[PDB]
Amino acid sequence: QGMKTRLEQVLERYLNGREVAVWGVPTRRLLRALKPFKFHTADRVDPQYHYVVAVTDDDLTDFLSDEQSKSFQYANDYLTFDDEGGELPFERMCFNVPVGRQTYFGDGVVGACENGYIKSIGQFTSINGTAEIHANHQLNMTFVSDDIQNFFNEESMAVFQEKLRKDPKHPYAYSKEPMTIGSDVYIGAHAFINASTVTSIGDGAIIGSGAVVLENVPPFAVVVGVPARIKRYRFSKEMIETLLRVKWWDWSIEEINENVDALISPELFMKKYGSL
Amino acid sequence: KTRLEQVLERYLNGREVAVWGVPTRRLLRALKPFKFHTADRVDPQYHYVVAVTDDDLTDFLSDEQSKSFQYANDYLTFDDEGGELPFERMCFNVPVGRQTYFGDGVVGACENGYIKSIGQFTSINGTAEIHANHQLNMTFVSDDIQNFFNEESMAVFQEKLRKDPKHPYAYSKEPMTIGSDVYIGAHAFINASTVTSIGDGAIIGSGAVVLENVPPFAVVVGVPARIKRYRFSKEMIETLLRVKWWDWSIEEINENVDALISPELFMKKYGSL
Amino acid sequence: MKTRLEQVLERYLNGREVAVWGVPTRRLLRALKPFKFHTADRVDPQYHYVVAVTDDDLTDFLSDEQSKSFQYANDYLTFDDEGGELPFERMCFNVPVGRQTYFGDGVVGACENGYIKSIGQFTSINGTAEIHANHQLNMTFVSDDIQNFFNEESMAVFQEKLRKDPKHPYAYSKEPMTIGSDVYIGAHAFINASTVTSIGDGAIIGSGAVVLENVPPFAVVVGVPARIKRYRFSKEMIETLLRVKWWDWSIEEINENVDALISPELFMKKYGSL
Numbered sequence: 001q002g003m004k005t006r007l008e009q010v011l012e013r014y015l016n017g018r019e020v021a022v023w024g025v026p027t028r029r030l031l032r033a034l035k036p037f038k039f040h041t042a043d044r045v046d047p048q049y050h051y052v053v054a055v056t057d058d059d060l061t062d063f064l065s066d067e068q069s070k071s072f073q074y075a076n077d078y079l080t081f082d083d084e085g086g087e088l089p090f091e092r093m094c095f096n097v098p099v100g101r102q103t104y105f106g107d108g109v110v111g112a113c114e115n116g117y118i119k120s121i122g123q124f125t126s127i128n129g130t131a132e133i134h135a136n137h138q139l140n141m142t143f144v145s146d147d148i149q150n151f152f153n154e155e156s157m158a159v160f161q162e163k164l165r166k167d168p169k170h171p172y173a174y175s176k177e178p179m180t181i182g183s184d185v186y187i188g189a190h191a192f193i194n195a196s197t198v199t200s201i202g203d204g205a206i207i208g209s210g211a212v213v214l215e216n217v218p219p220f221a222v223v224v225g226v227p228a229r230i231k232r233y234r235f236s237k238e239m240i241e242t243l244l245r246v247k248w249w250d251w252s253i254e255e256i257n258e259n260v261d262a263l264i265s266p267e268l269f270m271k272k273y274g275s276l
Numbered sequence: 277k278t279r280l281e282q283v284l285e286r287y288l289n290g291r292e293v294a295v296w297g298v299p300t301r302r303l304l305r306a307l308k309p310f311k312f313h314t315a316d317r318v319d320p321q322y323h324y325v326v327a328v329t330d331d332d333l334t335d336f337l338s339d340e341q342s343k344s345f346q347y348a349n350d351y352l353t354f355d356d357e358g359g360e361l362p363f364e365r366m367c368f369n370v371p372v373g374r375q376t377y378f379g380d381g382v383v384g385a386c387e388n389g390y391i392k393s394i395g396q397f398t399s400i401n402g403t404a405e406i407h408a409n410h411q412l413n414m415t416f417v418s419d420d421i422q423n424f425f426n427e428e429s430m431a432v433f434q435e436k437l438r439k440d441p442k443h444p445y446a447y448s449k450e451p452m453t454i455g456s457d458v459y460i461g462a463h464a465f466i467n468a469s470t471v472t473s474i475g476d477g478a479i480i481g482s483g484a485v486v487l488e489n490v491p492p493f494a495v496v497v498g499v500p501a502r503i504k505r506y507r508f509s510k511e512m513i514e515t516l517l518r519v520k521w522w523d524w525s526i527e528e529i530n531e532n533v534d535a536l537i538s539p540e541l542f543m544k545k546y547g548s549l
Numbered sequence: 550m551k552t553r554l555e556q557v558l559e560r561y562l563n564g565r566e567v568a569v570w571g572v573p574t575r576r577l578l579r580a581l582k583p584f585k586f587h588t589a590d591r592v593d594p595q596y597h598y599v600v601a602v603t604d605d606d607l608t609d610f611l612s613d614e615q616s617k618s619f620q621y622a623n624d625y626l627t628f629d630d631e632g633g634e635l636p637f638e639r640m641c642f643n644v645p646v647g648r649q650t651y652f653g654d655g656v657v658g659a660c661e662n663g664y665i666k667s668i669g670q671f672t673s674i675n676g677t678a679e680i681h682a683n684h685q686l687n688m689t690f691v692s693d694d695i696q697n698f699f700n701e702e703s704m705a706v707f708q709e710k711l712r713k714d715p716k717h718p719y720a721y722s723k724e725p726m727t728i729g730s731d732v733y734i735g736a737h738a739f740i741n742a743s744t745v746t747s748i749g750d751g752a753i754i755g756s757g758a759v760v761l762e763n764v765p766p767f768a769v770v771v772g773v774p775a776r777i778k779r780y781r782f783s784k785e786m787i788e789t790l791l792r793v794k795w796w797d798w799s800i801e802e803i804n805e806n807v808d809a810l811i812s813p814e815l816f817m818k819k820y821g822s823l
């Protein structure tokens with residue numbers, strides 16, 4: 001019943017008949033994910049024969065200081081286990097939340113993926129690890145608690161859950177669409193997005209540090225403050241829609257390199273793609 | 277007395293602890309008064325499974341063996357001092373009511389003597405923080421400078437700290453009482469030097485910085501925290517404080533679930549008249 | 550690049566054996582390779598330097614009755630605590646940190662990213678404080694890891710605009726930030742490494758404050774964004790504090806002026822300018 005690890009998705013694509021070399025104190029969840037593969041505790045490693053798996057980020061710090069690590073490419077030959085939110089060169093799943101290329105995030109939103117709060121996360125999105133995404137409890141009852149249900153019997157729970165499924169303010173993200181976090185998004189430190197009231201973080205939206213987001217963010221909007229407010233937009237409204245049609249975040253690696261000057265210069269991006 | 281110890285004193289029932297995960301020195305110290313082993317084949321009739329990390333419990337509950345293990349009754353996580361429980365428990369020496377949970381920041385607050393008790397059915401976000409102020413009336417704001425103080429220098433340092441009316445390090449003030457039916461959001465902050473109570477039913481929004489007492493059933497948001505609304509009318513707040521549903525038995529909670537679900541039904545039933 | 554533990558063992562081990570309290574990690578064994586270590590059992594400070602692997606391991610040790618004879622730093626230390634205070638000036642990565650100054654893992658990462666030039670003495674930084682920089686905001690994209698798809702030539706142009714940018718994305722083309730002495734920083738506080746270069750001596754950053762520019766010495770900043778609430782002392786006292794620099798005193802001098810450090814009024818009647 002174990003969900004598919006981020007490590008499992010990498011090994012499925014890059015192990016290539018090698019043996020996994022565990023770098024660090026192995027854990028029960030790691031051993032569980034490493035069952036269908038040949039693995040051993042790492043000593044002397046070779047990218048021809050071994051794929052290095054550092055258990056903790058502390059273990060990766062140790063591996064990347066070692067001389068043997070210089071022959072190992074990120075993702076292609078090594079990876080960290082305890083980093084479910086780490087970026088990848090391909091489109092992955094987090095639990096069952098699709099996550100695009102070069103998109104990383106922390107543990108608060110990994111849990112938000114587990115809670116069914118997020119529908120999907122786009123490409124090239126940078127989310128600070130300390131960002132958090134939680135829902136609201138019911139606000140229309142005599143109690144605000146959630147774990148009182150542990151004391152509810154079958155009859156008391158049927159009538160509790162029935163009201164939640166009808167609450168139009170979506171407690172615990174009920175009866176609402178899971179939120180989509182677009183591509184080219186930046187989320188600052190200590191940011192919070194209410195999962196009960198937000199369904200869309202637009203493409204290109206920039207959420208400032210310490211911002212509390214209670215509503216949808218328009219595409220390429222910059223929001224700051226408690227509560228978050230639109231301070232500026234990244235580009236004009238004509239480039240905003242042109243961006244939403246050109247969709248550079250879905251290019252190939254060869255196309256990204258072939259349009260580097262357009263990605264580096266928004267003015268040149270317009271002179272190249274803003275055809276009418 | 278650790279949280280695992282309080283459960284094992286209650287629900288182990290002569291079984292043997294099954295350690296799901298790599299054991300730590302502190303867990304090995306707590307499991308000393310019982311027999312234990314590394315979990316392989318587990319049966320809830322023979323074993324109480326104890327997951328070391330939250331990552332261990334996730335692996336255990338996804339195993340086909342956990343299908344007959346009940347929460348707290350048959351299993352528990354050791355590195356979850358702030359996890360909820362079906363009976364009133366102690367966090368260090370801070371009482372905590374039933375179905376109430378918090379994070380490690382609040383755990384350290386309990387350890388620092390900042391909290392007097394935490395009520396029933398209270399939901400505290402793990403990223404919530406509770407710290408006190410340093411001394412602000414002296415030439416230095418540092419605390420660890422006292423590590424360079426000798427026996428005579430700290431006699432006068434500690435002397436003025438306890439005289440300080442602003443309660444540096446929560447000095448000369450009652451510890452903080454967090455009521456029942458309380459909700460506190462993520463990244464919230466409560467100042468242990470200037471806050472003595474969070475009322476019953478109080479709701480602290482995410483990202484809110486609480487510097488003064490929150491009234492019962494008040495909804496506070498912002499930096500600093502300010503009251504945005506009250507949960508119920510004044511009359512229901514009076515009756516909610518006389519009834520105290522959070523102290524009901526499991527029986528009364530299930531019997532009056534209709535009153536717990538609808539505030540208006542609660543009002544006619546337990547209201548004054 | 551010595552660790553916090555390596556710095557302490559080179560100075561206080563004194564021919565003893567390090568006794569490891571807890572399950573040893575890969576990075577701890579590597580730090581302990583030049584020393585004589587073994588699993589802790591029965592420990593004596595005349596014989597052993599107890600090393601606790603995790604914060605959770607040290608709590609277990611100090612509750613044990615064998616810890617009653619050990620002293621902090623001199624006789625025991627925690628491994629996973631690069632931001633923990635020390636009774637001497639230390640090096641976090643390659644960032645000088647003053648005596649009795651502590652921070653959390655976010656600021657340790659800020660030292661690793663080169664965002665911090667130095668951190669003063671007797672500075673108290675909450676563990677949930679953060680110091681991150683801005684990505685480029687004058688481009689078509691805000692991503693950083695998109696550069697993992699950049700080839701050799703595209704990387705050149707990208708890195709070129711970054712060093713040209715006057716707003717200092719990723720703290721480029723700007724001086725690393727200085728954090729003064731006798732500074733306090735509340736929980737959940739954030740300092741932008743792209744636009745800040747100095748946290749003045751004696752500054753106080755209140756909880757939840759978003760500091761977007763330099764904080765003067767002895768100013769108290771709060772809010773989102775952070776603005777000056779008050780100053781700890783008068784303008785004349787700040788100027789005397791900046792010349793006296795009590796945070797550079799010897800342990801003897803600190804005790805000899807414990808009355809001047811406790812009462813600001815006594816500090817001025819003794820060090821105030823003529």
Ligand SMILES: NC[C@H]1O[C@H](O[C@H]2[C@H](O)[C@@H](O[C@H]3O[C@H](CO)[C@@H](O)[C@H](N)[C@H]3O)[C@H](N)C[C@@H]2N)[C@H](N)C[C@@H]1O
Pocket residue numbers: 083084085086087104105106107126128129130662693694719
């Ligand atoms: N190191 C400096 C960089 O840090 C961040 O990016 C980096 C992220 O912080 C990294 O995040 C990793 O570390 C963070 C915690 O710091 C974890 O939350 C996250 N899941 C884990 O993947 C991620 N793996 C790589 C990415 N380029 C900043 N957004 C940009 C900055 O230049």
Ligand SMILES: NC[C@H]1O[C@H](O[C@H]2[C@H](O)[C@@H](O[C@H]3O[C@H](CO)[C@@H](O)[C@H](N)[C@H]3O)[C@H](N)C[C@@H]2N)[C@H](N)C[C@@H]1O
Pocket residue numbers: 115146147172356358359360377378379380399401402403
């Ligand atoms: N999983 C989704 C739910 O998460 C929270 O509740 C849950 C709490 O977050 C849980 O708390 C546990 O997990 C949290 C988060 O990591 C820890 O901070 C906490 N110390 C630990 O005890 C607790 N054990 C169960 C409770 N239902 C939300 N308040 C409600 C939400 O529906």
Ligand SMILES: NC[C@H]1O[C@H](O[C@H]2[C@H](O)[C@@H](O[C@H]3O[C@H](CO)[C@@H](O)[C@H](N)[C@H]3O)[C@H](N)C[C@@H]2N)[C@H](N)C[C@@H]1O
Pocket residue numbers: 388419420445630632633634651652653654673675676677
């Ligand atoms: N316990 C109560 C005290 O907490 C803090 O200080 C304490 C610091 O928070 C401690 O910092 C340690 O604990 C913190 C918090 O977990 C970690 O962020 C930090 N890396 C770790 O070194 C440090 N080792 C000791 C110092 N007296 C307050 N600043 C003062 C308060 O009286």
Ligand SMILES: [Cl-]
Pocket residue numbers: 146172
């Ligand atoms: Cl629920």
Ligand SMILES: [Cl-]
Pocket residue numbers: 419422445
């Ligand atoms: Cl103290």
Ligand SMILES: [Cl-]
Pocket residue numbers: 693696719
């Ligand atoms: Cl870069």
